[PDB]
Amino acid sequence: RNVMSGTWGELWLDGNKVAEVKKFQAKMEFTKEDIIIAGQMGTKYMGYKGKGSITLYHVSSRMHKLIGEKIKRGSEPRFVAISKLNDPDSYGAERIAVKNIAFDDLTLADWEVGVKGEIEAPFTFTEYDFLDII
């Protein structure tokens, strides 16, 4: 409905291709904190928090090291997913880039399960772009 979803694609950590994507679903949410800002006297758009689930496979053997380097630098890792949209005609686009993705609960062992198997994880995101316009 107001939920976006997609199937095949790729997951990236900066310039590194780190997994393939089987599917995703995402929803945008109005929070009370966003409601306060939009009501400020002194200004028709509103901030939003993105949340979803994504299913990953063919995880890179380099994920362990890439995450360790993020921790060393002090930077929580932020990803990009590219995926084939469901119902592309409704969007006027065939693919989506879901950006600034955070995985609050994915562990090193979860990444491990996704090398030879598949892993479904919740995620948050803050922006997106439509790709392959039609």
From TrEMBL:
Cite the InterPro entries for this sequence. Answer: DUF2001 (IPR018989), XkdM-like_sf (IPR038628)
Q: What is this protein called?
A: Phage XkdM-like protein
SUPFAM superfamilies in alphabetical order: Phage tail proteins
Query: Where does this protein come from, organism-wise?
Result: Clostridioides difficile (strain 630)
Q: What Pfam families does the record point to?
A: DUF2001
